[PDB]
Design a protein around this nucleic acid. Sequence first.
RNA 1: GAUCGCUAUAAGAUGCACGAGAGCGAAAGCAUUUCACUCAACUGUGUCCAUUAAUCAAGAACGAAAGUUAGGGGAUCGAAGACGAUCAGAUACCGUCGUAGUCCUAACUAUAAACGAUGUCAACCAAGGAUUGGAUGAAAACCUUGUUCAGAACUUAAAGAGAAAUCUUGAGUUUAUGGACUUCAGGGGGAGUAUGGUCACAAGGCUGAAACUUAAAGGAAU
RNA 2: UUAAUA
Lengths: 95, 83, 212
Amino acid sequence: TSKRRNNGRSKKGRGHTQNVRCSHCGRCVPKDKAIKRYQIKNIVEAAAVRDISDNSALTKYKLPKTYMKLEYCVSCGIHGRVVRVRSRTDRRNRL
Amino acid sequence: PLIEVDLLNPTAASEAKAHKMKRLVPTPNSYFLEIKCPKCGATTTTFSHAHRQILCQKCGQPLGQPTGGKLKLTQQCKFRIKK
Amino acid sequence: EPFSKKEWYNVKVPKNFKRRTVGQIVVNKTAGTRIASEQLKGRVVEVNLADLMENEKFGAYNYKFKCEDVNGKDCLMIFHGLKLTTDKLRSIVKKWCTLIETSVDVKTTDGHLIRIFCIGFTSRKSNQIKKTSYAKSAQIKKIRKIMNNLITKEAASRELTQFVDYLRENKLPKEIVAKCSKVFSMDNVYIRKVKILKAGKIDSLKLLDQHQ
RNA sequence: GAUCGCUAUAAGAUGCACGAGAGCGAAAGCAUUUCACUCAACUGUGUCCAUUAAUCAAGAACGAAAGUUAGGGGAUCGAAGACGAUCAGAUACCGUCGUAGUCCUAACUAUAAACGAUGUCAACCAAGGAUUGGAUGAAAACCUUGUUCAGAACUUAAAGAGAAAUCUUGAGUUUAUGGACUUCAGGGGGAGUAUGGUCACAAGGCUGAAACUUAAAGGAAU
RNA sequence: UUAAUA
């Protein structure tokens, strides 16, 4: 029956939550049920950082980063290896 | 509780910690006090948890402000507990 | 050849900034009923603030200017707006804190009508142990009303040109933090965008005062 | 003269990041900030009444989405439909276009995996750490701590229960069987079907069998 | 990308 005590959600004291769109499928998933991951990366890959820094017109300009929050449905979180299927006794670990 | 204490003779500290109703014999946490006026020498007796502006009987150096559970007496108002 | 008819004009920003020339802008040469000085009348130039001041402590601000006349191969610019750099705006949004946003419509002393946007964030404390730092709905409205009133006093009293140079000094963000700290712990206060809702009247002599 | 780039406009819709096992609400549900009008609850109380209470056939308000009626709006998406691919075929999945619809106002409809699949009220009840809103001491609104009231939760159990999964703010206190009240079920199908009654503009909703058929259908775990 | 049946 109940594979999870919380039913796979994060909703406890309410009846409805708004929807969000899967970043890969475009599916509609509720805000709590969606798999939310955060990403902070530089706009230049590790190979090209040296090339840009060589020929630059600015004194010591610091390369900016990009920040975006990605939300995945369950199907596209498992398939994209964002999350894995865990053991029956290891499902309970929340760290 | 697994460890148990006497239910007829609770300690003075234990009864003080408990809720005002959940004591052995329920007692109020409030009291009646009088406030000497900053302006004059008269003492006005009033409830501890008054729910209105407290004025002197002489003038009205307002002596207290009602704030959701206990009178907010002015910093210069001295009081004693009426027993 | 496509560039055979093209001309390059020098761009001049007002004297408020350390750097007076920011680049060159292209326009086709004149034609029958097409004058380049007439065509370079609605061009908006966007340049970083770390270039107009020649210091990189101003790098997270983009400034925009419009052209008001062509004074002999020179486009005399006037201030058109300012906006936080996209990387900076998204780098100051922490997760477990309350975000406070506001916008004010202020009429300057010299007649310009502008819109100013302010952002803020409830912060942690030195000895704070609990993870979250949220504010009640009462404290948010108190903070917003303070930063709404405080930003209006500093902006309405001064003209558009001197108010913009005031924004370069951190007095306003520092003063907001030092006046909303008696309600809640605030750390990051920035003016993310300034618009110009209604362009006030300008004169050539006033513009000449603005340009040397 | 597309895609692309800058600048300007005017409607529709939406309300990112903050946004959480956080809050509010009887449930459905509720997210730009300001001002009003309300409402509810918690806490505080040497304030008042004095049983006014609990659960409730009949009956009555609210009831997601879709759907219906009549105006306005008609951006995006898009049941139907039309193309192009894939395939043995593809009326589908993939791509392009696109009507009703999606949005607002007034009136219907009254159904959902409307779920915590766990009725409402009340008593007793093992160890914790944390959090939301108060009251109260200490430490100089914010924050760190002691106590206590209310709320959504979480962890441990060699204990209690259960067929087990699991439950512990109960699914415990039950063959050592009785705290109060209401609703529902009686092997699987036929079947929420036929007929009868009633509600609705309609789709449909509420009530609701029988003949016949069959030794299994089903639940949790290895 | 496609992969029906006993």
